[PDB]
Amino acid sequence: TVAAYNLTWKSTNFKTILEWEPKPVNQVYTVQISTKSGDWKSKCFYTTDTECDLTDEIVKDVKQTYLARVFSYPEPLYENSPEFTPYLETNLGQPTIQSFEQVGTKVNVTVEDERTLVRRNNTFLSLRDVFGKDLIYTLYYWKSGKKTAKTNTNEFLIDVDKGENYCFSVQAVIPSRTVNRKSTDSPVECM
Amino acid sequence: IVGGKVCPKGECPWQVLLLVNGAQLCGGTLINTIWVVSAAHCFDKIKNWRNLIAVLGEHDLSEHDGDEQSRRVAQVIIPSTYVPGTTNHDIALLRLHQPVVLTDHVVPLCLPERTFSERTLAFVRFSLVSGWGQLLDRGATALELMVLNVPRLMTQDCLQQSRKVGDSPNITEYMFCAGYSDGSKDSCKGDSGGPHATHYRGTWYLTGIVSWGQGCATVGHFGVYTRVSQYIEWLQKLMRSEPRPGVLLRAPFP
Amino acid sequence: ANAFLEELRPGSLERECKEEQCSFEEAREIFKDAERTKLFWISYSDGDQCASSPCQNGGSCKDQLQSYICFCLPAFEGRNCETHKDDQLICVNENGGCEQYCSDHTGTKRSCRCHEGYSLLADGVSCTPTVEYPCGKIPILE
Ligand SMILES: CCCS(=O)(=O)N[C@@H](C(=O)N[C@@H](CCSC)C(=O)NCc1ccc(C(=N)N)cc1)[C@H](C)O
Ligand SMILES: *[C@@H]1O[C@H](CO)[C@@H](O)[C@H](O)[C@H]1O
Ligand SMILES: *[C@@H]1O[C@@H](C)[C@@H](O)[C@@H](O)[C@@H]1O
Ligand SMILES: [Ca+2]
Ligand SMILES: [Ca+2]
Numbered sequence: 001t002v003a004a005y006n007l008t009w010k011s012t013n014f015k016t017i018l019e020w021e022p023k024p025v026n027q028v029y030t031v032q033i034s035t036k037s038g039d040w041k042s043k044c045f046y047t048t049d050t051e052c053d054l055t056d057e058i059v060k061d062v063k064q065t066y067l068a069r070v071f072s073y074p075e076p077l078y079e080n081s082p083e084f085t086p087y088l089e090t091n092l093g094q095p096t097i098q099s100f101e102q103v104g105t106k107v108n109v110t111v112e113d114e115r116t117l118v119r120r121n122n123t124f125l126s127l128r129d130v131f132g133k134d135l136i137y138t139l140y141y142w143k144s145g146k147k148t149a150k151t152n153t154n155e156f157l158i159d160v161d162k163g164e165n166y167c168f169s170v171q172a173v174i175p176s177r178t179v180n181r182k183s184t185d186s187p188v189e190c191m
Numbered sequence: 192i193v194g195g196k197v198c199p200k201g202e203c204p205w206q207v208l209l210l211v212n213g214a215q216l217c218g219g220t221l222i223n224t225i226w227v228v229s230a231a232h233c234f235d236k237i238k239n240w241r242n243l244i245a246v247l248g249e250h251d252l253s254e255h256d257g258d259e260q261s262r263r264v265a266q267v268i269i270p271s272t273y274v275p276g277t278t279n280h281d282i283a284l285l286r287l288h289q290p291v292v293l294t295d296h297v298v299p300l301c302l303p304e305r306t307f308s309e310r311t312l313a314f315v316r317f318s319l320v321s322g323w324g325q326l327l328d329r330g331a332t333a334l335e336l337m338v339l340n341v342p343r344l345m346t347q348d349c350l351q352q353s354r355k356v357g358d359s360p361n362i363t364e365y366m367f368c369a370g371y372s373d374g375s376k377d378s379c380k381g382d383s384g385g386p387h388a389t390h391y392r393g394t395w396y397l398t399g400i401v402s403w404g405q406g407c408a409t410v411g412h413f414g415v416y417t418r419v420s421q422y423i424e425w426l427q428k429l430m431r432s433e434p435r436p437g438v439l440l441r442a443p444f445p
Numbered sequence: 446a447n448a449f450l451e452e453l454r455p456g457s458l459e460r461e462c463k464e465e466q467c468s469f470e471e472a473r474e475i476f477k478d479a480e481r482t483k484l485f486w487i488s489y490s491d492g493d494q495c496a497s498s499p500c501q502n503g504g505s506c507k508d509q510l511q512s513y514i515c516f517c518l519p520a521f522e523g524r525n526c527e528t529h530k531d532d533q534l535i536c537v538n539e540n541g542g543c544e545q546y547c548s549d550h551t552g553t554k555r556s557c558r559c560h561e562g563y564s565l566l567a568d569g570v571s572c573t574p575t576v577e578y579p580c581g582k583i584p585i586l587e
């Protein structure tokens with residue numbers, strides 16, 4: 001048998017999947033995940049895939065730091081994964097502009113508060129529910145010269161020259177972050 | 192024990208105190224009213240085999256009370272593969288001359304089935320190690336029973352996290368590391384033979400025996416305990432066996 | 446798209462990319478600028494990865510750039526919600542929910558057991574003491 005390698009974390013909006021190599025040949029795998037002081041919990045028992053969904057385990061506390069390891073079967077051979085702190089590292093999904101109404105010389109741009117995989121009281125918490133004040137939205141717009149706006153909520157109230165048309169784009173952003181601080185630019189919408 | 196705390200009288204009821212010629216020798220673990228599990232190296236320099244005593248329900252070596260029960264050790268069974276002075280197969284099964292009385296202060300630790308211990312208990316992060324051993328590396332021993340909660344490590348991690356010491360003992364499949372490498376908490380010499388008890392869903396089980404390690408709470412090193420799971424069958428067979436003439440007995444392993 | 450003579454008409458996002466599929470060139474004729482055109486094209490042309498209906502067992506698909514995310518129902522998990530949480534009643538999985546011992550069984554379900562001095566309750570997973578001082582229990586705390 002061969003120990004797994006290149007263990008990587010694929011997480012977006014808390015949908016966290018651990019991947020590795022190589023493509024199993026006469027060997028199956030079993031993953032274990034835990035917090036530094038917690039017990040080890042097994043997942044994806046004797047799977048032949050080179051991935052394992054750990055979303056249900058990590059959403060129990062997104063601010064914890066998890067370690068996972070992939071066991072190999074023909075103590076068993078294994079390989080540890082990088083530590084993973086959901087709250088600090090999960091990528092922000094692509095935003096979606098929910099709408100924008102004009103009011104004379106101003107335009108209110110609303111950013112749809114997308115949902116995450118974090119279950120809470122039989123429901124899915126939004127991006128806002130989880131990050132609260134740590135999440136802001138930035139706006140990249142132009143008179144259909146660049147322009148930008150920022151908001152600590154899900155809406156932008158900006159000034160616009162009456163008559164001319166505008167195009168918008170937004171990015172979810174967690175300023176405090178060091179890595180993965182911004183999501184990809186949302187699709188463009190024009191008034 | 193280094194970096195631990197006093198085990199409140201009665202909360203470490205399976206702890207055994209082993210004496211030789213009336214002197215403190217090692218720790219042990221009661222697993223039933225007649226048998227005690229300890230470490231084989233605790234007997235490397237024994238000469239008066241008829242002078243081994245096991246004390247149950249102990250707590251404070253400076254004050255006697257009615258919870259103490261003494262029993263002559265009628266037999267010390269060590270694996271045939273064990274070599275005095277070396278680390279492998281550091282286990283011993285002791286038969287008491289007369290059963291001890293189970294009470295609120297004297298209770299046996301459960302000996303688990305092999306697979307249960309391997310597939311479940313082995314992944315329970317924390318476990319308790321205890322004894323009247325040294326409180327500091329090279330320091331003096333404890334008057335009151337001490338206990339410490341230590342985290343378990345798979346050998347690959349232990350090796351990777353332990354700084355290579357010139358020609359140090361291999362951590363075999365009959366061992367496992369547990370403790371901290373920051374030099375603050377670990378068991379020690381005087382705790383040898385003592386239990387490494389794991390708590391699982393309301394019941395405590397025997398998963399290890401204090402065996403060896405680089406000094407006591409040495410930076411870059413972990414404590415090493417005998418992996419009891421590898422001896423379940425060996426122990427059960429002996430406990431159903433007839434007593435032998437002499438005290439010392441070497442039983443084949445496997 | 447381009448029909449006979451329509452190109453004589455000025456650009457129109459609605460008429461060309463909204464009410465129709467528009468090539469990169471047509472998009473470029475509406476936005477003009479290079480970056481503006483690109484910022485629009487990455488999403489517009491990305492396609493909907495959720496079109497395959499990948500999220501199984503009643504899951505919900507959320508489209509993303511060249512990928513997706515499945516939101517599963519409580520009793521499911523996995524990238525596509527393919528994993529049945531109720532189909533993991535094996536010993537290695539949390540000791541099969543057994544309080545003490547667990548024994549796997551090919552075909553049938555796993556069976557739980559107990560250590561001497563205890564007995565399996567009618568629930569099939571719990572163990573209770575059959576003696577005054579069972580092993581692994583601390584009297585002054587019970
Ligand atoms: C006290 C440390 C002595 S030492 O020289 O640093 N380490 C040796 C040792 O443990 N020897 C054994 C005896 C021969 S091998 C079974 C021993 O002392 N065992 C007692 C013991 C118990 C616990 C710990 C610990 N957790 N640090 C250390 C030693 C080993 C074999 O190198
Ligand atoms: C639906 O489309 C996505 C595109 O990535 C593919 O990954 C799925 O397998 C398919 O069902
Ligand atoms: C999308 O989310 C999943 C979990 C289910 O609740 C679906 O009914 C919903 O549309
Ligand atoms: Ca005393
Ligand atoms: Ca057209």
Ligand SMILES: [Ca+2]
Pocket residue numbers: 446447448451452461471
């Ligand atoms: Ca056209």
Ligand SMILES: [Ca+2]
Pocket residue numbers: 459464
């Ligand atoms: Ca229209």
Ligand SMILES: [Ca+2]
Pocket residue numbers: 460464465
């Ligand atoms: Ca048309």
Ligand SMILES: [Ca+2]
Pocket residue numbers: 470474
């Ligand atoms: Ca053109």
Ligand SMILES: [Ca+2]
Pocket residue numbers: 452455456457471474
């Ligand atoms: Ca055109």
Ligand SMILES: [Ca+2]
Pocket residue numbers: 452470471474
């Ligand atoms: Ca054209």
Ligand SMILES: [Ca+2]
Pocket residue numbers: 491492493494508509510511512
């Ligand atoms: Ca897409």
